[PDB]
Design an enzyme around this catalytic site. Structure first.
Site, short mmCIF file in Angstrom:
data_model
loop_
_atom_site.label_atom_id
_atom_site.label_comp_id
_atom_site.label_asym_id
_atom_site.label_seq_id
_atom_site.Cartn_x
_atom_site.Cartn_y
_atom_site.Cartn_z
N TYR A 105 0.86 -1.18 0.00
CA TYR A 105 0.00 0.00 0.00
C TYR A 105 0.89 1.22 0.00
CZ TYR A 105 -4.26 -2.59 1.27
OH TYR A 105 -5.28 -3.45 1.22
N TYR A 142 -1.04 -10.10 0.62
CA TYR A 142 0.08 -9.61 1.42
C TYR A 142 -0.01 -10.17 2.84
CZ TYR A 142 -3.57 -6.37 2.71
OH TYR A 142 -4.74 -5.82 3.17
N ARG A 158 -3.44 -11.98 3.66
CA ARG A 158 -4.75 -11.59 3.12
C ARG A 158 -4.85 -12.04 1.64
NH1 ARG A 158 -8.08 -7.93 4.17
NH2 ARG A 158 -9.41 -9.77 3.82
N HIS A 186 -7.51 -8.25 -2.53
CA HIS A 186 -8.83 -7.67 -2.33
C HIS A 186 -8.77 -6.21 -2.62
CE1 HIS A 186 -6.45 -7.05 1.26
NE2 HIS A 186 -7.16 -5.95 1.46
N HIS A 214 -10.72 -2.73 -1.28
CA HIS A 214 -11.57 -2.16 -0.24
C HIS A 214 -12.56 -1.22 -0.91
CE1 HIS A 214 -9.03 -3.32 3.27
NE2 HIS A 214 -8.04 -3.25 2.41
#
Ligand SMILES: O=[N+]([O-])c1ccc(O)c(O)c1
Ligand SMILES: O=[N+]([O-])c1ccc(O)c(O)c1
Ligand SMILES: O=[N+]([O-])c1ccc(O)c(O)c1
Ligand SMILES: O=[N+]([O-])c1ccc(O)c(O)c1
Ligand SMILES: [Fe+3]
Ligand SMILES: [Fe+3]
Ligand SMILES: [Fe+3]
Ligand SMILES: [Fe+3]
Lengths: 202, 238, 238, 202, 238, 202, 238, 202
Positions: free
Chosen positions: B106, B145, B155, B158, B160
């Site tokens: 991120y 990640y 995870r 995905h 969000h």
């Protein structure tokens, strides 16, 4: 009939998406923020601030908060408002903010809302609707902020009276303070534990 | 048509607040039950965002942060429809999305995973649904990640997402996954949702006929919000 | 579009005239077969009722006969759609209903069941479907009651209904029951209908998302009438 | 494709719902009844009456009857009428009645309908469409009423000629009588047995 | 026969104290585990109530509070047998019942539901089982009603009951439901019971052969209490 | 073998059924209540009172309480008592009460029970068996009330000694007070939290 | 215990009056439905027969008509219990039986079947059930026989029986068959009974442990009569 | 719960078993028959006779008939009679008969029964309960015999009034005749067709 899409936590990076400007990502020209007062907005200006604490008393520094409220006359800037009254044309009624990464303080610049009709002819005390998102929170937590200087109105508020524990009603009342001319309302939120803030299923 | 309140949220269709397998929830979940209230004008209204303020690339995560080149990763289009529980389209709702890049990294100060940063990827977009409730955005498929829950927690890929629509009671933030990802079966965050059918409601499906030759793949993902009931007798809202 | 005749009524989807387990039918059923005719203007037309003549409480059986108080019983809303067999909505059709009160007692001179009369309940209502074929009325759920067929015969709770719609050939009177009533399995009147799927077509379904908090429950019940065929070649009607 | 909702008997209380006024229930301001003649209605006034008998000859005192007919010129007051002729504006064409609880007699005040086109250019004799509901009757019984003074027209009626038993054709013809200036047509219906009235599947 | 202690209560056959879907239990459930004790004379004894003190209409809820007329609602008889877990009848046990009226309204100061009050219905009765463990009472079937747990929560129709029998350890309060009620599947209070077979143990069954023609329907409902073990070796009770 | 019928909460109206007289419902001639002393009952008269609190310290105003105890000589008025001693003939040994709707106080008028044999030749200290029912309580909660002036007997009580936490043993001891000649024992019950009262599976 | 009326007869558990495959029923069945009445003292009473009047061999069809020798055929004992529908024994009920001999020939003037007559067999017996509802008789197993319905119709072996018990409403005549007879599947008289489970209720079962060595086989056959309901409230019988 | 054993026809030989004496089978010393009058029986002696006809009017010569009735004071000789009145000790109240093989006539010698209480304080008119068995009859047919000289009582009989067709009520009334001093009541039964006798489900 369909089932509502299930909620999931916003996660620890909820501001990349919701407040990019503050994560240093300049992708949008117009950015949403925590200032609801435009230059022609009517009403008395107030600052709302506080911190959000976890079960051990540590402030959450990854929290995302939004508020939704009526204008100075208690009219919502929404097509769903059926009061037949004109709303202040220079008021969005919504804002969003995150906590400061170091301190954990969050704030909004807005105005004190006017009273809004309640159900069956009742009148609600002035309040701001608030929602909280963060890593660890699986579904956004809804609460309301009332004002300690509206004690008369608060005593007749339908939602507050529907809470049978009077000790819990007080968690929903912000305290008015006056920092150098500005009116500030302090509202701390305790997600869990002693003096846990009341949360609603709305 | 005079509208009444939104249908009650079905708590069994959502995760509970306290979910011990997702460790961070242990100290961030209320111990008291939520207090249910009857809705008023506060819960049935919501703000309006104008399309005029959105830039041309706000729904194009491939180009909206590109400086020297294109971001690295799998080009994908995601589209679908937002409707309420009674099947009506949700018009002009604000859909905001954010995600990691192809490495699972991120663009946030606190993310120090070794997965490499992409100088041409930002990771956030927004759009308004149209009159049919339709939305479409383009992006790079995010990579999975690691995160610290148990030490080797991962995870699934995905994206969000967040929706602000017609009533405050509809306010929703969630995440959708990609059909076939094997990490979906092991994720403690996705497992906070009690039923299998609801876990499946978060999986975006490969939409092969809508792939764009020599260009991008496409996933289809629909979203359902709470719906309002109509009133035919006493209108107690006010 | 030029309309032709209504589709033939499917006699296997309805009870027969002679049904010995429903004793009163033994002397009130023709011995000769019905004579089928080809339709004319007489069978494809029907009257029109204007909404102007209906009072404000005509579809509200809870209040339309209330004098000193409210009737005693379970507050319920019943709603649904009227369509023809090809799925088209049936607009401005007159729906009339009548039923017993919560005790299973009708406000009729000949009903002398010991179940108590309710001075605030009348038991009859009417409405016109809207342009989508939708109708909605509110009432008190009726109680089951005894009748003399075999000596201990009991009707399940039911609401009687009648429809006058676009063509005389669509004229229909029937009855709907409430999901889960155990008397449904034993009723000789409901058992005159030959097939199980058609018996199920008369059961109104609990509609939980449409209950009104602290007020009333809700049942959903759809009705299907005969439908007209379109003509593309010779129009022999006239 | 969908199946028609199955029919069920109207039951013995079919007038609570369909003729409340006569069960002494005053719930509606405007009530439907058996008088089709308004003051400006065109045509010759006639009274239609009779009794309905069960298989043993006992009259049904719980029966509900409705009739549907064309105006004086053979035009139906219905949007489905495709004659392109104007209908009498003061005519509903429909009415409803129950039998008297003591005697079993039923009646309507209406007018003698004009002839209506039949299929493929034919002309139907004047007739009134009638339906019967009652406890014991699982599906409403359809029949038609023709007039004995229209013998010429009746002999050329398509529906009547489609009945191969001439002895059964006569069950559909009402008899004209003249009670003190009024024209009355007597039409008795026998549901079962000897001289059983013809019923149609329409 | 020398009697020993009651069999241990099987905690897996009962709801747990803390049941988050029933919100009021969140602050009214002990955080500590219950402390199990070996029984003494205190736990194996219980009081005796004499039949002499019961009035003639104590088990007739249709007439015991009737003043000007009969209560409005469905006339029903409920009967059955009370036995212990080893199948022995429970004789002269005191059975007390209370319930809402046909509207789902209780004759309690705090019940302000709009469902109408019935001036001829009280809602409470009591009886002693006979030597075969048999009990029978007559009443009006209660209507379901709304309550505030989630805002649109509705209880299925039910009758509350309490039993004081031979030993204090048998003391039990519960509720029984009516066969076929669709609200049974959605009730968070009934869902506190972990197993399906035990949830079914609270449903009273339609007893058609025992309906009374032109009068009342009948439900059959049996109750099982803890049973005492016999002692054949050391009698440690005292 | 059969499974015990499952327990369910008594709900918020548990007194319509169990104490109708106090809900203003006069359906019974003889009503059960909280007075266990008849005029010829033997023993020293005592009043037992207290309040029941939820996890936040709020008293329950919808609670139903029953007590079961031995007579003055430690004999139960029950056919299951095997002491072979005659019981006081003017003593039911049981009573029932609800909390006052405003204050939340509950009480009983009874007598101080005598000591009852314990298992294997032991002797139990004087105690009253108590059970609590209320909305939110899925299964009646069992506890016992011991008396602070029976410290010698309490130290040798089998049930009290079976509780390994001495701090929890004290939650079961009522305090003796003397209000104008009357002996009163105060026993407050905390269902959850700090100083949570001990509950038993009996 | 105050007794009320007998439970209503369940007409679906019995043959209908008109059964076209049993030709003689075509002109001997009422065209009108039976008229159900509420019971009075006339329907709940019945006569009493004293055991004193029965001879010692009345239940022994092997010896009660034997003159020069024993009848020819298979020696069998038939026994069982008569109870009412609620399971209570039926005491001192009069059970009468009649049957053909081993050839399938009845000792009746009108029976001219070629199957041979047995000079030592009569074919009729009677008994009173005991306090447990038990009855026992001995006989020769009857043979099947031809009759004229369709020309080649054959009855399975059967024994005709009649019961007069406590109430006139219990009056019953029927027939029982023998386990395994293949003619049972083809008999138009047995097929007048609508359900398979009820057809099975007429088959007597081989009872091997009760055969008497070197003497006789044994069949077990139980009979169920209508049962009376108990009254606990108003006793309207009189 | 159990299902009643299903009925089956008595078949054409129903008298081998039920009236052996008349099929020439002497197996029993005491035989049941159609004479209900013993020498000390109280009441007026009457003879009941008739024929049973099939749908074509042919008399059944294989029919078996039984009757059940009260004594002269309307008391049943049955332990289930709850009138608390003493019954005539020389009266069985039941008999059985078959039709004569040639003529088809059946008969009983009995006495005229007295009136019996009906439900809810009503009084029933004098009647005899009768049942019919025969080849072709799958379940015994129940009917009742009333007397034409009890017109006053018959008009108030609950069972007769419960028959809505007055033309059918008459099928249940026997006609009194006086053959040489003896009182005879003629009661013919038509199982099917015109003037079909009323049968009951009791
Ligand atoms: O722990 N983290 O860093 C996480 C956990 C879940 C997420 O969806 C995320 O974006 C970050
Ligand atoms: O026999 N009755 O009285 C009846 C039978 C059926 C019905 O639907 C009814 O309303 C009344
Ligand atoms: O919340 N209430 O009011 C309730 C909940 C459950 C009950 O069984 C009841 O009688 C009342
Ligand atoms: O026609 N027969 O002769 C018959 C028919 C059935 C029988 O049970 C019988 O005994 C004789
Ligand atoms: Fe993430
Ligand atoms: Fe009905
Ligand atoms: Fe309740
Ligand atoms: Fe036979």
């Amino acid at each position: 009939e369909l089932k509502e899409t299930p909620s999931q936590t916003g996660g620890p990076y909820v501001h990349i998406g919701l407040l990019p400007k503050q994560a240093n990502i300049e992708v949008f020209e117009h950015n949403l923020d925590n200032n609801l007062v435009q230059d022609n907005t009517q009403g008395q200006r107030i600052r709302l601030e506080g911190q959000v604490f976890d079960g051990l008393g540590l402030p959450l520094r990854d929290v995302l908060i939004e508020i939704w409220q009526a204008d100075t006359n208690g009219v919502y800037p929404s097509q769903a408002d059926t009061q037949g009254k004109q709303v202040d044309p220079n008021f969005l009624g919504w804002g969003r903010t995150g906590a400061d990464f170091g301190t954990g303080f969050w704030s909004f610049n807005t105005i004190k809302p006017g009273a809004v009709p309640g159900r069956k002819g009742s009148t609600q005390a002035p309040h701001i609707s608030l929602i909280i998102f963060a890593h660890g929170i699986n579904i956004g937590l809804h609460t309301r902020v009332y004002f300690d200087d509206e004690a008369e109105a608060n005593a007749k508020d339908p939602v507050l009276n529907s809470i049978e524990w009077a000790t819990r009603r007080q968690t929903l009342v912000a305290k008015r303070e006056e920092r150098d001319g500005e009116v500030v309302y302090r509202f701390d939120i305790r997600i869990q534990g002693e003096n846990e803030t009341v949360f609603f299923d709305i | 048509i005079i509208w009444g309140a939104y249908a009650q949220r079905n708590t069994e269709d959502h995760p509970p607040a306290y979910a011990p397998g997702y460790k961070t929830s242990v100290l961030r979940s209320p111990k008291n039950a939520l207090i249910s209230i009857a809705e008023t004008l506060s819960e049935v209204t919501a703000p309006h965002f104008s399309a005029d303020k959105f830039g041309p690339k706000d729904n194009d995560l491939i180009l909206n942060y590109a400086k020297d080149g294109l971001p690295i990763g799998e080009r994908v289009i995601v589209h679908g429809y937002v409707r309420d529980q009674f099947g009506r389209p949700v018009k002009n709702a604000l859909v905001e999305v954010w995600q990691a890049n192809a490495s699972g990294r991120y663009r946030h100060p606190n993310d120090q995973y070794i997965g490499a940063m992409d100088p041409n990827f930002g990771g956030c977009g927004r759009m308004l649904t149209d009159d049919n409730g339709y939305y479409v955005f383009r992006t790079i498929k995010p990579g999975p990640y690691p995160w610290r829950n148990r030490i080797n927690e991962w995870r699934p890929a995905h994206i969000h997402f967040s929706l602000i629509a017609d009533g405050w009671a509809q306010r929703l933030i969630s995440q959708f996954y990609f059909e076939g990802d094997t990490l979906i079966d092991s994720c403690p965050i996705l497992k906070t949702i009690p039923s299998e059918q609801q876990r499946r409601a978060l999986i975006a499906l490969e939409d092969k006929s809508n792939f764009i030759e020599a260009d991008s793949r496409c996933y289809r993902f629909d979203i359902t919000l709470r719906g309002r009931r109509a009133t035919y007798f006493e209108n107690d809202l006010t």
